[PDB]
């Protein structure tokens, strides 16, 4: 039985924990967070125990929420910690595992050096068999790894340049802009996605751009593929269709916008409208030849929880890729084909 | 038991048509609807019944998704209809209620004429029953009517000024702007809210002005009522702490912003993020002898839904005001008090 915590109860953090709890193999200890807010009040009313920084407690005592007992509380209680705490706080709390002997998963806004290795279950789930400490690569990275591991079974992926237009931050985040800006992050090419997909996939061609927009909802993707071989759009459209973690959007139900695609995931009831897969808009999928084009749309907040969960089993090595992938897959209801 | 049939499957109608479902003296008979979107699709696949205008029967089924019958056919069959179709096709659908005898609750952006009463429920249900044609206010209109009548207990309301802030269009609505401007809506006053409270309290001395804010998940009220005797603070504040379809938002938890009061409802996982309560500001609730200043938000795609459980009830002359608003608010999970 693998009992986890986890550090820093965020828009990430919250989605594992509720993750944790459905898997049949794993149970939560409790979570951690600094600031007693209503995602700590409404974390305390479902039942999750919640540790604090001892500095902290004091102050984050006077809310009425009870606290558990200290970060390190938890960490040495656990038997390892998927960490979602803010950029570069993962680095800060690493020498803390370390000294406690516990594995850890990371988010991918740590600097790689932060972990044994870089992950994405599509992709190297195999050869994180066993690490101590690996890094989940970014939400943007997770998507581009899942597409391309995906198309590259049809064929070797030669080169890949991408267009990354990322939303500016979450909808409940009230103080960040832009509020009416493009604003290139960063204006340097290429943008940090290409080197993080090469921590997984060591000798891909990659080069990458991103730029934020003032949206809150979901990022999109542009992509240019080049293939080895000359291959045929029902091969591209076949695998696409059949991969869970990947689902394609049609043009028949008028629901091809970010927004709207938000609404069918309300009115699908799904966990706080969370899409967690790849949305390839069926209609952008372009192949001709040896090049494929096409477009798609990422979930932000969710798309890198099932990627913690297959995470934890890979450190630990609970079971191959294919079984971790088939539990965590089908207890939080994963889809694959076409969403709408 | 009561059949009852959804004329306009769009924000208001898919909700109504759930909370039909939810009802223990009620069954949903089908809905109504002219496009084939992704609405009508995830409708059709849970099983709801389709019914299309005439006219668009064909181009309907182009889409596979079947068709129970005309939209005359689903009246036909209910024992009552719930329109909540566009402002304007609520008068046009009348005639048609009429000739085929069948009784019908219409949504606020109709004129009052359309129907033989206005209503809200913690207003005027008694004087609703047995009225086969009822308008349920708007959402605005509805959210200042629960606080009138609630804080009417406490000493009469003698007067009422607002100001309304209305969110541009919803979330799923990607083709309405504005963008980036505030816009009066209209400039001159009263807005019709005014008339609008004034069909339920008829000598209400209220007036009101609204604006359009570029936001997309909640309105906004800023209200001053004028009492006809002077009161106590704590009075006010009990009265508003202890009625459902009211609940209080403290400065607690650091949730005092629209996008974190979805936040909240997302992760206190109701349906679709619904919030049907007028949100009312606690730290906001100014009480000086004769005069009260509070704010609240108003979660437009939701706020109706029970009122318009009620108004079938009281239409249908089914049970008792107090009888039929428990069931709507037991089974829909309406709250009252602090709901953070």
Same mark, same amino acid.
């Given at each position: ?19 944790? =709890?459905?898997?049949?193999? &794993? ?35 006077? %809310? ?7 970060? *390190?509380?938890?960490?040495?209680? +656990? #038997? ?136 809150? @909802? &979901? ?17 591209? /459209? ?7 973690? =990947?689902? @394609?959007?049609? %043009? ?8 709207? @695609?938000?609404?069918?995931?309300? #009115? ?5 409208? #969370? ?9 952008? =999928? ?6 494929? &084009?096409? &477009?798609?749309?990422?979930?932000? *907040?969710? =798309? ?10 890979? +450190? ?7 079984? %971790? ?9 994963? /889809? ?5």
């Amino acid at each position: 039985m693998v009992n986890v915590a986890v550090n820093g109860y965020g828009t990430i953090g919250k989605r594992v924990a509720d993750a944790i =709890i459905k898997q049949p193999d &794993m149970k939560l200890v409790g979570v951690a967070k600094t600031s007693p807010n209503y995602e700590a009040f409404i974390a305390h009313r479902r039942g999750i125990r919640i540790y604090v920084p001892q500095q902290s407690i004091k102050k984050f005592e006077e %809310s009425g929420i009870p606290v558990a007992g200290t970060v *390190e509380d938890l960490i040495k209680t +656990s #038997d390892i910690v998927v960490d979602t705490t803010p950029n570069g706080v993962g680095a800060q709390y690493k020498p803390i595992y370390l000294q406690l002997q516990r594995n850890a998963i990371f988010q991918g806004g740590e600097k790689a050096e932060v972990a044994d290795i870089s992950f994405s279950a599509l992709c190297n789930y195999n050869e994180a068999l066993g690490k101590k400490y690996i890094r989940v690569v970014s939400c943007n990275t997770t998507a581009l790894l899942r597409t391309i591991c995906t198309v590259n079974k049809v064929s070797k992926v030669e080169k890949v340049r991408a267009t990354i237009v990322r939303r500016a931050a979450d909808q409940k985040e009230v103080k960040k802009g832009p509020i009416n800006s493009l604003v290139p992050d960063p204006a340097t090419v290429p943008s940090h996605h290409a080197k993080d997909v090469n921590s997984v996939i060591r000798n891909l061609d990659i080069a990458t751009m991103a730029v934020i927009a003032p949206t809150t @909802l &979901m990022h999109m993707h542009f992509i240019n593929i080049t293939l080895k071989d000359k291959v045929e759009k029902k091969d591209i /459209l076949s695998v696409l269709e059949n991969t869970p973690r =990947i689902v @394609l959007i049609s %043009s028949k139900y008028d629901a091809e916008a970010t927004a709207e @695609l938000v609404e069918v995931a309300r #009115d699908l009831k799904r966990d706080r409208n #969370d899409i967690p897969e790849v949305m390839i808009f069926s209609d952008s =999928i372009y192949v001709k030849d040896d090049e494929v &084009m096409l &477009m798609y749309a990422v979930h932000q *907040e969710s =798309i890198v929880v099932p990627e913690n969960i297959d995470a934890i089993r890979a +450190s630990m090595k609970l079971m191959s890729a294919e079984d %971790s992938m088939r539990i965590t897959n089908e207890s939080l209801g994963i /889809l694959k084909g076409y969403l709408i």
